[PDB]
Design an enzyme around this catalytic site. Structure first.
Site, PDB file in Angstrom:
ATOM      1  N   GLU A 188       0.788  -1.194  -0.017  1.00 50.25           N
ATOM      2  CA  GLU A 188       0.153   0.170  -0.120  1.00 50.25           C
ATOM      3  C   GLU A 188       0.810   1.169   0.015  1.00 50.25           C
ATOM      4  O   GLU A 188       0.740   2.189  -0.656  1.00 50.25           O
ATOM      5  CB  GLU A 188      -1.061   0.058   1.085  1.00 50.25           C
ATOM      6  CG  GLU A 188      -2.040  -0.920   1.017  1.00 50.25           C
ATOM      7  CD  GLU A 188      -3.064  -0.671   0.029  1.00 50.25           C
ATOM      8  OE1 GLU A 188      -2.834   0.210  -0.385  1.00 50.25           O
ATOM      9  OE2 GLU A 188      -4.016  -1.542  -0.348  1.00 50.25           O
ATOM     10  N   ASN A 200      -7.529   9.115  -5.829  1.00 50.41           N
ATOM     11  CA  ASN A 200      -8.317   8.070  -6.419  1.00 50.41           C
ATOM     12  C   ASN A 200      -9.062   8.814  -7.485  1.00 50.41           C
ATOM     13  O   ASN A 200      -9.455  10.135  -7.500  1.00 50.41           O
ATOM     14  CB  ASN A 200      -9.320   7.330  -5.637  1.00 50.41           C
ATOM     15  CG  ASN A 200      -8.584   6.551  -4.365  1.00 50.41           C
ATOM     16  OD1 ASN A 200      -7.489   6.095  -4.474  1.00 50.41           O
ATOM     17  ND2 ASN A 200      -8.759   6.724  -3.185  1.00 50.41           N
ATOM     18  N   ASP A 252     -12.479   9.121  -8.126  1.00 53.92           N
ATOM     19  CA  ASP A 252     -13.625   9.567  -7.521  1.00 53.92           C
ATOM     20  C   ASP A 252     -13.570  10.634  -7.020  1.00 53.92           C
ATOM     21  O   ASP A 252     -14.332  11.341  -6.033  1.00 53.92           O
ATOM     22  CB  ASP A 252     -14.549   8.418  -6.740  1.00 53.92           C
ATOM     23  CG  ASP A 252     -13.967   8.292  -5.574  1.00 53.92           C
ATOM     24  OD1 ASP A 252     -12.686   8.260  -5.218  1.00 53.92           O
ATOM     25  OD2 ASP A 252     -14.441   7.781  -4.552  1.00 53.92           O
ATOM     26  N   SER A 269     -11.729  11.198  -4.153  1.00 56.34           N
ATOM     27  CA  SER A 269     -11.254  10.777  -2.635  1.00 56.34           C
ATOM     28  C   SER A 269      -9.653  10.405  -2.763  1.00 56.34           C
ATOM     29  O   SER A 269      -9.232  10.453  -3.486  1.00 56.34           O
ATOM     30  CB  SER A 269     -12.035   9.544  -2.292  1.00 56.34           C
ATOM     31  OG  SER A 269     -11.452   8.291  -3.115  1.00 56.34           O
ATOM     32  N   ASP A 326      -6.509   8.168  -0.679  1.00 55.25           N
ATOM     33  CA  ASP A 326      -5.994   7.441   0.405  1.00 55.25           C
ATOM     34  C   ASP A 326      -4.824   7.786   1.118  1.00 55.25           C
ATOM     35  O   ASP A 326      -3.780   8.628   0.690  1.00 55.25           O
ATOM     36  CB  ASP A 326      -5.633   6.175  -0.312  1.00 55.25           C
ATOM     37  CG  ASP A 326      -6.824   5.369  -1.078  1.00 55.25           C
ATOM     38  OD1 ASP A 326      -7.690   5.424  -0.742  1.00 55.25           O
ATOM     39  OD2 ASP A 326      -6.192   4.256  -1.570  1.00 55.25           O
ATOM     40  N   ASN A 377      -9.042   5.405   2.908  1.00 53.46           N
ATOM     41  CA  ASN A 377      -9.604   6.288   2.045  1.00 53.46           C
ATOM     42  C   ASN A 377     -10.460   7.478   2.748  1.00 53.46           C
ATOM     43  O   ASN A 377     -11.384   6.892   3.758  1.00 53.46           O
ATOM     44  CB  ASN A 377     -10.275   5.324   1.170  1.00 53.46           C
ATOM     45  CG  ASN A 377     -10.794   6.161   0.087  1.00 53.46           C
ATOM     46  OD1 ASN A 377     -12.482   6.391   0.124  1.00 53.46           O
ATOM     47  ND2 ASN A 377     -10.210   6.311  -1.106  1.00 53.46           N
TER      48      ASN A 377
END
Ligand SMILES: [Cl-]
Ligand SMILES: [Cl-]
Ligand SMILES: [Cl-]
Ligand SMILES: [Cl-]
Ligand SMILES: [Cl-]
Ligand code: NA
EC number: 3.2.1.17
Length: 129
Positions: A35, A46, A48, A50, A52, A59
């Protein structure tokens, strides 16, 4: 703060992730390698809108507040920035909530794709634990 593998396995163990919800430590260390590269300050945006955050790439769509994911929630009730600290406490406490949510560690795409089903204990061999 960028941890080494064993350093992070120790910290993780110290915050109670070993066998949490039945997930042995190596699952957690694997997840974090893939990650975030063991970097607490990692951030990724991301599709959309959003983002992380942190060593477990948690998220904003659902778990933390970043002020720029319109419509989202803050289930961990934390600023997303708390997930970036050198102290992993807020990322671990929030990871404990996530893993308890229904889907287990499948919430973490890198876990599913790279760690699930593998000999994750490799990830903690040679560590002082
Ligand atoms: Cl490594
Ligand atoms: Cl927001
Ligand atoms: Cl820490
Ligand atoms: Cl599960
Ligand atoms: Cl393990
Ligand atoms: Na949010």
């Amino acid at each position: 703060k960028v941890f080494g593998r064993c350093e992070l396995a120790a910290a993780m163990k110290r915050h109670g992730l070993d066998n949490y919800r039945g997930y042995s430590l190596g699952n957690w260390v694997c997840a974090a390698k893939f990650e975030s590269n063991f970097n607490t300050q990692a951030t990724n945006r991301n599709t959309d809108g959003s983002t992380d955050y942190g060593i477990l790439q948690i998220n904003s769509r659902w778990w933390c507040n970043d002020g720029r994911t319109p419509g989202s929630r803050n289930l961990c009730n934390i600023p997303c920035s708390a997930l970036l600290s050198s102290d992993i406490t807020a990322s671990v406490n929030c990871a404990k909530k996530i893993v308890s949510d229904g889907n287990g560690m499948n919430a973490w795409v890198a876990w599913r794709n790279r760690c699930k089903g593998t000999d994750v204990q490799a990830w903690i061999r040679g560590c002082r634990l």
